[PDB]
Predict the 3D structure of the following.
Amino acid sequence: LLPAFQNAERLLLAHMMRSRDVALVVQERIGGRFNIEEHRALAAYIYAFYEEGHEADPGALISRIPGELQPLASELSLLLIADDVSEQELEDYIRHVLNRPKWLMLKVKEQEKTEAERRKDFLTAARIAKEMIEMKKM
Amino acid sequence: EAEQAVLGAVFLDPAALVPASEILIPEDFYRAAHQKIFHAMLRVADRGEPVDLVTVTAELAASEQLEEIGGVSYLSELADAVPTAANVEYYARIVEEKSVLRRLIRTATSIAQDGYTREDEIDVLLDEADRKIMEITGIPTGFTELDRMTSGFQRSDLIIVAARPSVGKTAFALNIAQNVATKTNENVAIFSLEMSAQQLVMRMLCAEGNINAQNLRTGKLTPEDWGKLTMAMGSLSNAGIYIDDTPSIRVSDIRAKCRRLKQESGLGMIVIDYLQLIQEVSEISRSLKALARELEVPVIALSQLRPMMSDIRESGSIEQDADIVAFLYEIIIAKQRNGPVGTVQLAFIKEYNKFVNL
Amino acid sequence: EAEQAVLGAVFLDPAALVPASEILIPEDFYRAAHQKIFHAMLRVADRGEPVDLVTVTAELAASEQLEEIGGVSYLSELADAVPTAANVEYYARIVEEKSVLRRLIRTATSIAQDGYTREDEIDVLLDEADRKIMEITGIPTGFTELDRMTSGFQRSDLIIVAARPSVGKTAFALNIAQNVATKTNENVAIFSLEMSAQQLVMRMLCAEGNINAQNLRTGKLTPEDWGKLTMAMGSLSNAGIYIDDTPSIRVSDIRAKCRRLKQESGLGMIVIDYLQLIQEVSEISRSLKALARELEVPVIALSQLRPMMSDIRESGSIEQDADIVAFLYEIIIAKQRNGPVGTVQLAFIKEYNKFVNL
């Protein structure tokens, strides 16, 4: 059913693709900085697009867009959205994308907890775990 | 998909549940699974306690549909999938819409299917087919100081005139209908469920040419009576009165007949003779209000019961549908939304059967 | 799952242990591993020192059950799993319940099992069968000396005012609602299930400009009443009152409309007109408390019943959900959590429909 951040990555494209007024907001905030290679390649194409002074519609985008991106870019332009992204919607999506490298992180110390646990260093792994609970609260 | 969004967003906010629940009931959801969840979601909210993954999974388990949905896996799937809870409401509207569409289809398909199995009814079929599918200003009264408190009778209001038997409620509504017909230029529609259409006519013929002790009923007249009916007949001969004494009719037929008359000739007043006698009454009250609204015309519904509000109220709503409630006792306008509430006093002749000014 | 939540929540708050241990002892947990942890959790709290991941993984190790649970792996799992510790209690109640059920089954099964082996007794069997089966802050009120005992009305409290028919329970609530709206700068939301929205407004128009024997009801007024209402209307005009007279509404709808009003304008008080008339009541009581807590706003629920506690208790809970219970008789503040319990005396005008100081 797909993890949150991915859906936000997805939907965000679905919006900027349709509205190039949104894409301009996404650009200063997310690089990307997008987390999935496909989404990164598409965002590079989207951003460009309008910088070609270019009006705005997917009929144009999906026609751009190497061809290996098309099967995906096509099925994003059909997704399902209200046209209009709520003020907070955007901050909620961008927050997910932006603070995804931070979750991909704590699984680095996750492997350190378990490696400490294996050498019977129980109080060290505990600390690591207490550390994670902190990053996790963010 | 939008279904999964609402459910999801609840696991997220979960103040999300509030707008979701203002717009959905469990039944709006297409999948039973979600129905179950959304119900449990609410059933936990009715404490409580609050609503979150473990607390729902626990209500679902309790009433034992946990594994009858997904597992906790599908609950988590929903929880982890959703990226924001600033939509929900939504989403909600989407699910609510697609719900309405299923009901539309169902009640419409139930009509076709029902078309062959009755046959038999046509009239019950055509009525429970609307029923199923549904789920001074002014106009002067004739009477100087009734006009003032009300300024009409205006268009889209339902006026209910109540009075105990034989106080004069018919004779009152008839004079209103008469004045409006003879003095303005505005068609009036009368439904006289009780009395015949021709025993109604002399009751407004008497009301005019100031005729009758002599009497129309008891055969012969004097030269003064004859020379009188002739103008009374004459004057009322050009008025815009339409009568329908059809024994006792259902609402949809008042509504259908009044509708056809509006496009072909005009229409200004619908004066229904007594409500309690049309063919629960709260469901009729409702329909009369809508009738008035649709035709931009004041509907005068006479009613049967001192007096005051709770005399009629105890027998079928009315109170909150009628925007002006008159009582014959004294004419007591006990409720009106135009403005004032008080007692207007009218004289009553008898011999001529007139209500008159003062 | 509920079990995991409790333990998890402790590693989070960990002031979550206090209510957890008020409701659970280790044996209430079904899984032994959880029994061990919760116990260890409690053994540490018994100094000391305080209770967090490290310290607990230490105690467990010390009594050598660390690997006999999960590892620290499972401890981290609980921790890292749970999102919130504003439940716990909970959660606690869930685990406590399923604990009680197990006990029932155990002692019931032991009766059946015991039904064959004795036989013999009948009377020790039947007796040890019962034996076994039985085991100022605030928001000012306007009224000087009510304020003192309470200091508000404060935010997150459910205040229930009960009084026999026609002692003044509505009039009392209204005047509170009024003083708060006209005198502070804080919106109040009134639900007046019984009386109509506009019948209510005069009752607090009258309770101002000191108007009425003359009367507003019975038509005409003096140049003293007229020039009075104008200020009364004027002063009440700018107040922050919001009325909803919707016939009889379910709680989820009180909670929904009040939630919207908070984000768009403000909100300080919800004054519900009478509880016994909203649409078992123990399930409504619970909800009103949770409404007050969510909106950080005092909810005044009026109720219908000398008086004293058991007069409303016998009709649905309330007692343990309401944190301040007022009686009208004398205003008897019979229960409150801020502090004092006792009688405050208030004057009552009637003609003006006002409760006044003394």
